[PDB]
DNA sequence: GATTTTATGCCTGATTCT
DNA sequence: AATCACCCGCACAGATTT
DNA sequence: AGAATCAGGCATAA
DNA sequence: AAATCTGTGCGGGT
């Protein structure tokens, strides 16, 4: 037993929550918009080697293997969070490709673990491109057992298109999604000049545009919330009057509802309203909605104008609605308020870190490759002293000490070895006392064994041509790379090459109508 | 209604424990020592009496189950702390963020409600393990990280361990353990600074010696210096980095603004070095370890370490394969939650009453307590979000440099 | 909308869940003993290498991956399966060994799937021996994909070591366990004489032997049910009455109970007997039963008697107890009741088959190995003009067309080649154009495919002579193979020894003792 | 309590459903027509009447809840079967066994307790779809077993396949789907006599010439027959099992059989092709397969499968190679049970009354069927496995074999 | 992570009829 | 086989008191 | 006084 | 008749 002052216990529990869940939960990554359960799930599911073009897994699986190795937290929350992303209304982008009962536009429900089944999507894979060329920092897990990514090499505008919300200690984000072509003509006008002001943005980038398509009644709040990072905007359904004469009966026919509303709740919530007496001049309501669209039936009697009670109907339940556009992300592991620049900036960084990286990887990868094509090609050069050592020798061992002591003439294949420049196709970690001497050849350890796993088949013409066609390619790709690295100009021409694949490959149309008032 | 009381009537031998979760009820259940001891599962997290109203205090079912279980009343005119049962409260929540939020929560409304109950000291706060070591016969039960970290440097340095330099020195014991002590405080210093510096500048400083500013001067002086610091940076990198360098002068002193780049076309163009970082004392304090941590090695040297000889250099690496070494017969496990335990486990570890370990809650200020419980558990938002701004990692960056 | 019969739908229906149920559920199969699902379960754990000596398993992953393989069926079934498998006071010897909260004695239940640990035991990998030699049929699972063993190659008489229970629509099977050591000796005394009476064999099985160690009074019941099929016995448990003098007053210790029988239930039905006057003279009663043993006290009244108060006891409460003994089985896909000697001789017939199937694999796989080894010591013979010709090849295919237009001279190996004639060593499906005529090796596509995929490496003295070492040891195998099949008794030998070591490992005592009225 | 009403009031328009299964009602809730349809998930296997008693029968929740929501009464003096709602009933069990046995419940039920509702035809039985395929653009359900192979047999002749002889013939698609349907046919036959014969024997059969018993008698031209039928079977033979063949002349007509020793280790005593095998008209057929499947192809000969070729030696092949190469874009999805669909497909497939199909269960004789519910669902363990006995496998051997 | 009551056959003990 | 009954921040009707 | 009837337990499936 | 008060839902966690 020891006391201990209850203000300073409260003190540091709490402090402790607040920062857990504030850096832990919430707000997501700026770099890639996602947070870390959406991470977890996604690089699980892609170690089990779930692809898009083969067979379905069942969602327990994936959920044990989640819960069992990377993140330890209940069930629930997972299941959830994965059948979330399986829905086309609400994702502009859908990630996860589901098969089962997932739920519908009316806010249904969704079946058990063991009545369903997921995989990955086509879009997905362009999140995880480049995940095993050492692009990105490993962390440890929470027993120091796993390794999980700090973040996602992302090539999508994740943050932008698919939006987010999330509630913290103290505060709070919600982003709406945007369109892709429009965030992709956006970062590569930025690219060309980085002195753009927020109203040449404002021109390739009109507004939000929600899965949904519904309409955008206002063009004010948009500019505040892009210029400042907080707004607010109004979400009107569509609608229309048809008059079909004989006895001038008006009908209004509903289709398109706003972002985040449950139709049966939307219909109940009329039904209670006309019943009580609030709302008049309204005869019946259907429901005809089957397969091929959205449609709600509203009849009025005839001693009314349809003009007003859609007015009424329009200012008192939820057809129109009002979101509060709040940008809060997290920068360097802090919450920070952004705007759309910021945003753009911190995608084209991440991108030119990630080809970097990419980049040195593939020159080493070169540089070795040709390194042992080298030893291959000058010993294929020199055959009958190499089989007469061989079978002299009595053992392997001894077999591979003679051919390390003693220097190999280079023969007729000393035109492409001098033909390198210098020492671009040499590994950095390779000593000065092997390579290519001064009219002799020296063997690494390494390379008299490559040496000896040699078959009889490589003896023929065309497999002999074969490795000098593969070491000339070679010695263009480890140009190529250099040129690359040189220069800052390169990097910038490939980034936007990727960007244009990118918008070819998964451009899209615009859904959301935006009016003025 | 999830109450398993006790046999004992007598209000003043009697416990009471608030488990979370129902496995880890069951287990205390299945574990608690029948006689004088009760057990009231939470099935999760409670109502927050600071924001709720008082007639929905008491409809909700866990609030209710708990007054009821207490036994006293609530609400003025009706409460009587003199009529109380289970004199001793304990909470014994989970070990991680959800365990604290549920505390402060209940500890939130025992002051609010029941004042007296928490100054007359009937409140206590059990504390079980995290770590679990086995060595084949010593094995036993770890508190927080820093205890481990703390057992496993001793394990490191238990026994053995004698330095050979050059010749046959021996540092036997106390010099090494105390200079691997402060080597660790360093570091530990370094780390809670890393983010206004690279690892790689605070690493090398320390081999380096002294700035000597006595003799700097704005030419022939002030270029060594900066240049030796880059040469030796240079020449110790996997990660295709460049650090150059550049100087000037104010009338008043010559200062550095080296740079660095790596895996990137951007630069941030100053790391500068002026009297300000030199005047400060971390600067002294790694001066100080950098004078005895020099290239005392010589073309011979090794550890004399048990049935096992390591001759080598950058003392770092010895360092390592002596963590191996203390790691090579040792298992560790880490309970995940309350529910990994098993019911002998627990009875061992937080309620044998002549093996446990809790902590008595008191009251030092009221005023105080109020203002913080008004400012915190309130329904102003501002508040709350400014409290938690400053107290923030700047709070943390303490410029103290020791 | 076709009409239809009721009496016509519900004879199809019923008659097929019958039958589904009677060959599929509940009856086991009399070679092995297995029902599908523990036939299942085993091969699903076998698939995943979950061996007896690595790593254990989350039962969770082994019951999900046996429902979603081959068992298309709910997971509470198939997890209580493996629960059942795994406690040693159910099955004599235990097939699964587990790590967690399996159950008690006293009538405890085991935690869910989430928390227990599982992998295979010891003797089961015996039951799974030869499994891979093409030693059993496969068949198909219930969507065409999978392949499941028909039945699996048991080396241990599993149907009369660990009993049976099942009951199925129209029939139902009831089979005690017994002993292995006594069960190995009555095999082969059958073995040694094929027309040994029931009376033979009861010498060395002289009745069951559960794992709960209680006793056995009677001796009729056993013996009609070996020679008939069905019989009744009466278990006994084991108690004593003891005295200490001093007061004088004795106190009933029971020790043992009956086998399938709650310690909980029995004592609360004591409780409950003596409350309501029903037995005379009990004062106390306790249980100090933990960890050492099962102890149960009765302390008696001062004027009763230990044996009148105790004889009682087994009249009343369920100390003891009937089983009925009642042997039906699956002989070949149809229900049939069996005896002592009808179990013996399908066991037998079975290890007949699986030693010859094996034989016939093992004998192929050595012939076809021997005929890439004669063609690799022939061009090793001749390195010097292969390498020479393999030079001038303008295409792998043109060498191999040039290899197999081509005699060779056998050189110093034909005198090994003189151990290896008679036409013993050559493959089957060989034609006679090939091999050696006239002293001068021809070659096939294959053999000259195996000389191209030479390595250097094997030009050395030591890899030269390993290959006419594994030839000559190559030849001794096949030898061997041969006389095992040339011959009937050769097959019984091997039998009886495998029996003999399979008793030596895996011996153990009796525990259940016998008694006369 | 688990009932979703309709709205429809008048008791000649509405519908009820008996879904096996939570998860199948559950989504079957959410694709039905709301105005004139109901649903009542039952959850597992529900009470036998036959055996039961009529006190346990109204102590039961499930039997309780569908008698309270027919809406007629029970028993002898208060049943009344023209007071009933939902005059439509609808079984629509799942499509295994265990679906099989629920319908057989659920009929006895409606049979021994409301013999009017089953007499007047308000019964229904529901037929679900099993498989799903989809070849990119087409998508449809196909049920059990038969109408898959259906489907696949006219997927696999669906343009181009012209047969090759020679040069250039073409079989051009009725010639060739006459000559497929007959060789599965002819499969089909041979698969149900795996056991009085081995597959090779019969196999082997259709390439050799006809036996030609009429002028057959003593020529001793028999011995060269089974001679080369025994020395083509040893010559394709990777079993390790041998063949010799005995004859004798124990009649005018010369007898023959072969021996055949396999891996089980024993040798069958014979397998004789005796006056009933080749009088029988298995073998006719069998030979009148042959003399349209004899060497009809030539030294060169291939399948001329669309926008592709390949080179073929015998049909088998042919028909394998066209089999895969059909399955090339094609995706098969199979239904393990009702909880497998989502609400639109349920819809679509059997809750949608333009495009469902369905049973009408109707009574022919009555003592037939009273025999027959007394003999099945009875107390009576003997008659029962008698009855099962009499339709066991010694039933199943029918020797039309058409 | 904790949440119902049925089918199918053979044996027992306890209670109810004649 | 999905449901229990609360914590965190923000915006907006319908309902009470000044 | 002795047949006849009614519950509960056991192991794989909804 | 202007100003407080009182509920509901969005998405990851016991
Ligand atoms: C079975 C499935 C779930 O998962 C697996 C598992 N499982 C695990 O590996 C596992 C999961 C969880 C734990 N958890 C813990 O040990 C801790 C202990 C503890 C104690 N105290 N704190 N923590 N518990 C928790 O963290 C926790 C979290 C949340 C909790 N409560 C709530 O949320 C809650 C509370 C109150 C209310 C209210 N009002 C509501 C909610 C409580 N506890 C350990 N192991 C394993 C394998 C599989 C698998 O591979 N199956 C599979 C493969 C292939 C196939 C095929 O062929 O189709 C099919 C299937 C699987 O699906
Ligand atoms: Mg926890
Ligand atoms: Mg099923």
Same mark, same amino acid.
């Given at each position: 037993?020891?006391?201990?002052?209850?203000?300073?216990?409260?003190?540091?529990?709490?402090?402790?929550?607040?920062?857990?869940?504030?850096?832990?939960?919430?707000?997501?990554?700026?770099?890639?918009?996602?947070?870390?359960?959406?991470?977890?799930?996604?690089?699980?599911?892609?170690?089990?080697?779930?692809?898009?073009?083969?067979?379905?897994?069942?969602?327990?699986?994936?959920?044990?293997?989640?819960?069992?190795?990377?993140?330890?937290?209940?069930?629930?929350?997972?299941?959830?969070?994965?059948?979330?992303?399986?829905?086309?209304?609400?994702?502009?982008?859908?990630?996860?490709?589901?098969?089962?009962?997932?739920?519908?536009?009316?806010?249904?429900?969704?079946?058990?673990?063991?009545?369903?089944?997921?995989?990955?999507?086509?879009?997905?894979?362009?999140?995880?491109?480049?995940?095993?060329?050492?692009?990105?920092?490993?962390?440890?897990?929470?027993?120091?057992?796993?390794?999980?990514?700090?973040?996602?090499?992302?090539?999508?505008?994740?943050?932008?298109?698919?939006?987010?919300?999330?509630?913290?200690?103290?505060?709070?984000?919600?982003?709406?999604?945007?369109?892709?072509?429009?965030?992709?003509?956006?970062?590569?006008?930025?690219?060309?000049?980085?002195?753009?002001?927020?109203?040449?943005?404002?021109?390739?980038?009109?507004?939000?545009?929600?899965?949904?398509?519904?309409?955008?009644?206002?063009?004010?709040?948009?500019?505040?919330?892009?210029?400042?990072?907080?707004?607010?905007?109004?979400?009107?359904?569509?609608?229309?009057?048809?008059?079909?004469?004989?006895?001038?009966?008006?009908?209004?026919?509903?289709?398109?509802?706003?972002?985040?509303?449950?139709?049966?709740?939307?219909?109940?919530?009329?039904?209670?309203?006309?019943?009580?007496?609030?709302?008049?001049?309204?005869?019946?309501?259907?429901?005809?909605?089957?397969?091929?669209?959205?449609?709600?039936?509203?009849?009025?009697?005839?001693?009314?104008?349809?003009?007003?009670?859609?007015?009424?109907?329009?200012?008192?339940?939820?057809?129109?609605?009002?979101?509060?556009?709040?940008?809060?992300?997290?920068?360097?592991?802090?919450?920070?308020?952004?705007?759309?620049?910021?945003?753009?900036?911190?995608?084209?960084?991440?991108?030119?870190?990630?080809?970097?990286?990419?980049?040195?990887?593939?020159?080493?990868?070169?540089?070795?490759?040709?390194?042992?094509?080298?030893?291959?090609?000058?010993?294929?050069?020199?055959?009958?002293?190499?089989?007469?050592?061989?079978?002299?020798?009595?053992?392997?061992?001894?077999?591979?000490?003679?051919?390390?002591?003693?220097?190999?003439?280079?023969?007729?294949?000393?035109?492409?070895?001098?033909?390198?420049?210098?020492?671009?196709?040499?590994?950095?970690?390779?000593?000065?006392?092997?390579?290519?001497?001064?009219?002799?050849?020296?063997?690494?350890?390494?390379?008299?064994?490559?040496?000896?796993?040699?078959?009889?088949?490589?003896?023929?013409?065309?497999?002999?041509?074969?490795?000098?066609?593969?070491?000339?390619?070679?010695?263009?790709?480890?140009?190529?790379?250099?040129?690359?690295?040189?220069?800052?100009?390169?990097?910038?021409?490939?980034?936007?090459?990727?960007?244009?694949?990118?918008?070819?490959?998964?451009?899209?149309?615009?859904?959301?109508?935006?009016?003025?008032? | 209604?999830?109450?398993?009381?006790?046999?004992?009537?007598?209000?003043?031998?009697?416990?009471?424990?608030?488990?979370?979760?129902?496995?880890?009820?069951?287990?205390?259940?299945?574990?608690?020592?029948?006689?004088?001891?009760?057990?009231?599962?939470?099935?999760?997290?409670?109502?927050?009496?600071?924001?709720?109203?008082?007639?929905?205090?008491?409809?909700?079912?866990?609030?209710?189950?708990? /007054?009821?279980?207490?036994?006293?009343? /609530?609400?003025?005119?009706?409460?009587?702390?003199?009529?109380?049962?289970?004199?001793?409260?304990?909470?014994?929540?989970?070990?991680?963020?959800?365990?604290?939020?549920?505390?402060?929560?209940?500890?939130?409304?025992?002051?609010?409600?029941?004042?007296?109950?928490?100054?007359?000291?009937?409140?206590?706060?059990?504390?079980?393990?995290?770590?679990?070591?086995?060595?084949?016969?010593?094995?036993?039960?770890?508190?927080?990280?820093?205890?481990?970290?703390?057992?496993?440097?001793?394990?490191?340095?238990?026994?053995?361990?004698?330095?050979?330099?050059?010749?046959?020195?021996?540092?036997?014991?106390?010099?090494?353990?105390?200079?691997?002590?402060?080597?660790?405080?360093?570091?530990?210093? /370094?780390?809670?600074?890393?983010?206004?510096?690279?690892?790689?500048?605070?690493?090398?400083?320390?081999?380096?010696?002294?700035?000597?500013?006595?003799?700097?001067?704005?030419?022939?002086?002030?270029?060594?210096?900066?240049?030796?610091?880059?040469?030796?940076?240079?020449?110790?990198?996997?990660?295709?980095?460049?650090?150059?360098?550049?100087?000037?002068?104010?009338?008043?002193?010559?200062?550095?603004?080296?740079?660095?780049?790596?895996?990137?076309?951007?630069?941030?163009?100053?790391?500068?070095?002026?009297?300000?970082?030199?005047?400060?004392?971390?600067?002294?304090?790694?001066?100080?370890?950098?004078?005895?941590?020099?290239?005392?090695?010589?073309?011979?040297?090794?550890?004399?370490?048990?049935?096992?000889?390591?001759?080598?250099?950058?003392?770092?690496?010895?360092?390592?394969?002596?963590?191996?070494?203390?790691?090579?017969?040792?298992?560790?496990?880490?309970?995940?939650?309350?529910?990994?335990?098993?019911?002998?486990?627990?009875?061992?570890?937080?309620?044998?009453?002549?093996?446990?370990?809790?902590?008595?809650?008191?009251?030092?200020?009221?005023?105080?307590?109020?203002?913080?419980?008004?400012?915190?558990?309130?329904?102003?938002?501002?508040?709350?979000?400014?409290?938690?701004?400053?107290?923030?990692?700047?709070?943390?960056? /303490?410029?103290?440099?020791?």
């Amino acid at each position: 037993i020891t006391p201990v002052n209850i203000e300073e216990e409260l003190k540091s529990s709490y402090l402790d929550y607040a920062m857990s869940v504030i850096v832990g939960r919430a707000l997501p990554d700026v770099r890639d918009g996602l947070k870390p359960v959406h991470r977890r799930v996604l690089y699980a599911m892609n170690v089990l080697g779930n692809d898009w073009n083969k067979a379905y897994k069942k969602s327990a699986r994936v959920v044990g293997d989640v819960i069992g190795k990377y993140h330890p937290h209940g069930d629930s929350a997972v299941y959830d969070t994965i059948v979330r992303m399986a829905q086309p209304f609400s994702l502009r982008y859908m990630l996860v490709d589901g098969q089962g009962n997932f739920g519908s536009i009316d806010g249904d429900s969704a079946a058990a673990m063991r009545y369903t089944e997921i995989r990955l999507a086509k879009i997905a894979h362009e999140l995880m491109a480049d995940l095993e060329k050492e692009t990105v920092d490993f962390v440890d897990n929470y027993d120091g057992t796993e390794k999980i990514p700090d973040v996602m090499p992302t090539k999508i505008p994740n943050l932008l298109v698919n939006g987010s919300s999330g509630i913290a200690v103290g505060m709070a984000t919600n982003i709406p999604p945007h369109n892709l072509t429009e965030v992709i003509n956006g970062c590569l006008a930025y690219i060309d000049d980085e002195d753009i002001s927020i109203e040449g943005l404002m021109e390739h980038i009109p507004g939000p545009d929600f899965p949904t398509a519904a309409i955008i009644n206002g063009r004010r709040g948009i500019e505040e919330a892009y210029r400042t990072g907080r707004g607010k905007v109004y979400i009107r359904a569509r609608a229309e009057v048809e008059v079909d004469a004989k006895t001038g009966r008006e009908t209004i026919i509903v289709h398109e509802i706003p972002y985040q509303v449950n139709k049966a709740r939307l219909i109940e919530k009329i039904a209670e309203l006309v019943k009580e007496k609030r709302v008049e001049g309204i005869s019946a309501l259907r429901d005809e909605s089957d397969k091929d669209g959205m449609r709600i039936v509203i009849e009025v009697k005839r001693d009314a104008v349809g003009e007003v009670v859609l007015n009424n109907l329009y200012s008192q339940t939820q057809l129109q609605v009002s979101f509060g556009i709040n940008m809060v992300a997290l920068h360097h592991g802090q919450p920070k308020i952004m705007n759309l620049k910021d945003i753009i900036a911190a995608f084209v960084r991440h991108r030119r870190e990630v080809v970097t990286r990419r980049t040195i990887f593939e020159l080493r990868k070169a540089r070795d490759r040709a390194h042992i094509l080298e030893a291959l090609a000058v010993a294929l050069a020199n055959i009958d002293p190499i089989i007469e050592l061989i079978r002299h020798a009595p053992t392997p061992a001894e077999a591979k000490t003679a051919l390390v002591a003693n220097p190999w003439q280079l023969g007729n294949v000393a035109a492409m070895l001098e033909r390198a420049g210098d020492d671009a196709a040499r590994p950095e970690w390779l000593e000065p006392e092997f390579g290519v001497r001064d009219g002799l050849y020296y063997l690494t350890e390494q390379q008299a064994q490559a040496i000896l796993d040699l078959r009889l088949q490589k003896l023929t013409g065309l497999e002999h041509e074969k490795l000098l066609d593969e070491y000339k390619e070679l010695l263009d790709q480890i140009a190529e790379l250099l040129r690359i690295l040189g220069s800052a100009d390169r990097l910038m021409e490939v980034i936007r090459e990727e960007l244009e694949l990118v918008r070819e490959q998964f451009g899209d149309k615009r859904r959301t109508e935006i009016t003025a008032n | 209604g999830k109450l398993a009381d006790c046999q004992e009537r007598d209000p003043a031998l009697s416990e009471l424990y608030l488990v979370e979760g129902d496995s880890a009820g069951g287990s205390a259940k299945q574990g608690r020592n029948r006689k004088n001891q009760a057990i009231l599962p939470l099935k999760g997290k409670i109502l927050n009496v600071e924001k709720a109203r008082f007639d929905k205090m008491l409809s909700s079912q866990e609030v209710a189950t708990l /007054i009821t279980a207490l036994g006293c009343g /609530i609400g003025r005119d009706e409460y009587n702390p003199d009529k109380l049962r289970y004199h001793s409260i304990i909470i014994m929540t989970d070990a991680d963020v959800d365990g604290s939020h549920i505390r402060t929560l209940l500890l939130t409304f025992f002051y609010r409600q029941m004042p007296e109950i928490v100054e007359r000291g009937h409140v206590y706060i059990a504390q079980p393990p995290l770590y679990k070591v086995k060595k084949g016969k010593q094995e036993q039960y770890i508190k927080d990280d820093e205890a481990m970290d703390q057992y496993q440097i001793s394990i490191a340095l238990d026994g053995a361990t004698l330095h050979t330099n050059a010749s046959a020195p021996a540092l036997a014991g106390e010099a090494l353990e105390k200079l691997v002590s402060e080597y660790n405080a360093t570091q530990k210093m /370094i780390n809670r600074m890393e983010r206004r510096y690279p690892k790689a500048m605070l690493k090398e400083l320390i081999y380096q010696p002294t700035l000597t500013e006595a003799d700097l001067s704005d030419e022939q002086t002030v270029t060594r210096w900066v240049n030796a610091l880059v040469s030796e940076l240079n020449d110790k990198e996997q990660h295709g980095s460049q650090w150059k360098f550049d100087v000037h002068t104010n009338a008043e002193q010559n200062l550095f603004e080296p740079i660095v780049r790596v895996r990137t076309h951007g630069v941030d163009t100053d790391y500068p070095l002026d009297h300000e970082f030199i005047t400060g004392g971390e600067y002294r304090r790694i001066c100080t370890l950098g004078e005895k941590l020099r290239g005392l090695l010589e073309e011979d040297a090794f550890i004399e370490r048990g049935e096992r000889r390591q001759p080598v250099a950058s003392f770092e690496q010895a360092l390592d394969w002596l963590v191996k070494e203390s790691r090579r017969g040792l298992s560790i496990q880490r309970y995940k939650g309350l529910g990994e335990m098993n019911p002998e486990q627990l009875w061992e570890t937080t309620m044998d009453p002549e093996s446990r370990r809790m902590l008595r809650v008191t009251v030092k200020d009221a005023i105080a307590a109020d203002q913080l419980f008004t400012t915190l558990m309130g329904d102003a938002v501002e508040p709350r979000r400014a409290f938690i701004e400053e107290n923030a990692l700047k709070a943390a960056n /303490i410029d103290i440099e020791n």
